[PDB]
């Protein structure tokens, strides 16, 4: 009917990488052509802030607009658990819509990072699987990459985080390599970024 | 507004286990108190069938009913890729709603099942991780369990299937065991059920 609001968190990497810019994004869909004006109020821990920026209005081909406000967050503010509230007013609403988002609550726990070599049974294939088990972490926001000889290794896939029986998360990352590249003693590494790691970073190596 | 329809597939286990009964479920929500009658037509490969059964009507506390029709499917029919169509008629609809479901399309590929022992680095803990990598499978419907000494081992978690770079799926299953149970040479097994396995079943063992 009238507008709907969806509020999105930053990317885990952006909150953990010094390079990138974490932002909270408040998306308003089904804004009418009759009432395209939307007012945003933003609050951080209940304190109203005034540095949000509205993205270019996006007109959809179902006769609605999509209007989006972005609030840049301090890395430390997000990781410290601050509460971000977006309030949306529009003439087609009988009352403003409010959404609130934050990092998951609970004591952070440091990932344990374990590298597992290919199974002997897999050595009948041309390509073999290098496994990085990351477990015991909380909250679930995390990033995982691989390297080899100082260079990024990109032929990998990582599972979503899975809730474990002790209330931490685990996941696995699988890097696929030419078997010969493995047999030649090349050194591979699994890099993990998470808030409860020293400098938000660790790497563990794996080689034959 | 008026009713909505959601059509659900069988459980992978039910389609792969000789014991259990696979069914397709056509769920109609937001059925009004003014118009509670819903007519279902079911089609298998475009052929109308007449052996569906309607579940007991469920009245919700938002002044709507939930009405559900269940069609039992032959194991072989689902795995052979038959198309199941549910057609829903109701007075509040301007036209019937139709939904169609089937198994994912594409050539099946047999899972490769590899067991990986705990990392040496993990042996500083009281509990260690036994890993079952299942890869190269298609379609994604699969079930995984663990055993030890002929008995079911239940302290495990399995990742959802992840789409790999070659268009097959992989996943990992993690069984957590007392370290001493591992060091004592107990034999653990990862059991996998999938349509492209011989007898829809395989198991691989792991021990120190
Ligand atoms: C007219 O046409 C319109 C265009 O087609 C159409 O608009 C759509 O409306 C939909 C609803 O009507 C709306 O659906 C929601 O989608 C949510 C997910 O949205 C993302 O992912 C989509 C698919 O991948 C994308 O299309 C979206 O753009 C969005 O993508 C994300 O965007 C964010 C913000 O930009 C971005 O994050 C930012 O990224 C940047 C970098 O780019 C930085 O990193 C920033 O730091 C960062 O903030 C993401 O990266 C990007 N991600 C992706 C994957 O692309 C979805 O979550 C909603 O689901 C909830 O609500 C529905 C009910 O509608 C429930 O069915 C569902 O279960 C979910 O409900 C929640 O469940 C929770 C339970 O765990 C519960 O806790 C919650 O309370 C509960 N909430 C609710 C409300 O129930 C939802 O499906 C869709 O996004 C719109 N599409 C577009 C393109 O705008 C419109 O509907 C049409 N009008 C008609 C038909 O009348
Ligand atoms: C009045 O109050 C009502 C009750 O609260 C409320 O009813 C709800 O309405 C919702 C929509 O308005 C409806 O939402 C949909 O939910 C879908 C998932 O439903 C399941 O999982 C839920 C949460 O876990 C459960 O609540 C549901 O019961 C259902 O659970 C499953 O049930 C099936 C069938 O029984 C069962 O399978 C069977 O199990 C048995 C054993 O028990 C056997 O094994 C059988 O063999 C087997 O068949 C499952 O096990 C069971 N699973 C679980 C997990 O419990 C959800 O999938 C829908 O999402 C789609 O649509 C929404 C739009 O509404 C999108 O936002 C979303 O992105 C999805 O869209 C799809 O996206 C695809 C992209 O990949 C795309 O390909 C599709 O085209 C696209 N489709 C559409 C339509 O867009 C959806 O969220 C909810 O289920 C209702 N809840 C209940 C309890 O009925 C009602 O709304 C209220 N009225 C109001 C507010 O006015």
Swiss-Prot record, chains A, B:
Q: Name one GO molecular function term.
A: Fc-gamma receptor I complex binding
Q: Please give the residue ranges the record annotates as the region CH2.
A: 1-105
GO cellular-component term (any): extracellular exosome
Task: Report the record's Gene Ontology biological process terms.
Answer: adaptive immune response; antibacterial humoral response; antibody-dependent cellular cytotoxicity; B cell receptor signaling pathway; complement activation, classical pathway; complement-dependent cytotoxicity
Q: How is it modified after translation?
A: Glycosylation on Asn-62 is required for interaction with Fc receptors and ability to activate the complement pathway. (Microbial infection) Deglycosylation on Asn-62 by S.pyogenes EndoS or Endos2 endoglucosidases prevents interaction between immunoglobulin-gamma (IgG) and Fc receptors, impairing ability to activate the complement pathway.
Q: Which residues are glycosylated?
A: 62
The alphabetical list of record keywords is: Adaptive immunity, Cell membrane, Chromosomal rearrangement, Disulfide bond, Glycoprotein, Immunity, Immunoglobulin, Immunoglobulin domain, Membrane, Secreted, Transmembrane, Transmembrane helix
Sequence ranges assigned to domain Ig-like in this UniProt record = 3-102, 111-207
Which branch of life, at top level? Answer: Eukaryota
Q: What does this protein do?
A: Constant region of immunoglobulin heavy chains. Immunoglobulins, also known as antibodies, are membrane-bound or secreted glycoproteins produced by B lymphocytes. In the recognition phase of humoral immunity, the membrane-bound immunoglobulins serve as receptors which, upon binding of a specific antigen, trigger the clonal expansion and differentiation of B lymphocytes into immunoglobulins-secreting plasma cells. Secreted immunoglobulins mediate the effector phase of humoral immunity, which results in the elimination of bound antigens.
**Assembly:** Immunoglobulins are composed of two identical heavy chains and two identical light chains; disulfide-linked. Interacts with FCGR1A; this interaction mediates IgG effector functions on monocytes. Interacts with FCGR2A and FCGR3A.
Tied to what disorder?
Answer: Multiple myeloma: A malignant tumor of plasma cells usually arising in the bone marrow and characterized by diffuse involvement of the skeletal system, hyperglobulinemia, Bence-Jones proteinuria and anemia. Complications of multiple myeloma are bone pain, hypercalcemia, renal failure and spinal cord compression. The aberrant antibodies that are produced lead to impaired humoral immunity and patients have a high prevalence of infection. Amyloidosis may develop in some patients.
Q: What's the protein called, per UniProt?
A: Immunoglobulin heavy constant gamma 1
Q: Which organism is it from?
A: Homo sapiens
Q: Which gene encodes it?
A: IGHG1
């Amino acid at each position: 009917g009238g507008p709907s609001v969806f509020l999105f968190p930053p990317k885990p990497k952006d909150t953990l990488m010094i390079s990138r810019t974490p932002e909270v994004t408040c998306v308003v869909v089904d804004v009418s052509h009759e009432d395209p004006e939307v007012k945003f109020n933003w609050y951080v821990d209940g304190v109203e802030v005034h540095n949000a920026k509205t993205k270019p209005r996006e007109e959809q081909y179902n006769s609605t607009y999509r209007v989006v406000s972005v609030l840049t967050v301090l890395h430390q503010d997000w990781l410290n658990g601050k509460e971000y509230k977006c309030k949306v007013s529009n003439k087609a609403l009988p009352a403003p819509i409010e959404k609130t988002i934050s990092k998951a609550k609970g004591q952070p726990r440091e990932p344990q990072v374990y590298t597992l070599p290919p199974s002997r049974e897999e050595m009948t294939k041309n390509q073999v699987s290098l496994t990085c088990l990351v477990k015991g972490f909380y909250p679930s926001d995390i990033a995982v990459e691989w390297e080899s000889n100082g260079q990024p290794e990109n032929n990998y896939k990582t599972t979503p985080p899975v809730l474990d029986s002790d209330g931490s998360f685990f996941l696995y990352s699988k890097l696929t390599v030419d078997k010969s590249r493995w047999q030649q003693g090349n050194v591979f590494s699994c890099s993990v970024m998470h808030e409860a790691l020293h400098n938000h970073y660790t790497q563990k190596s794996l080689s034959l």
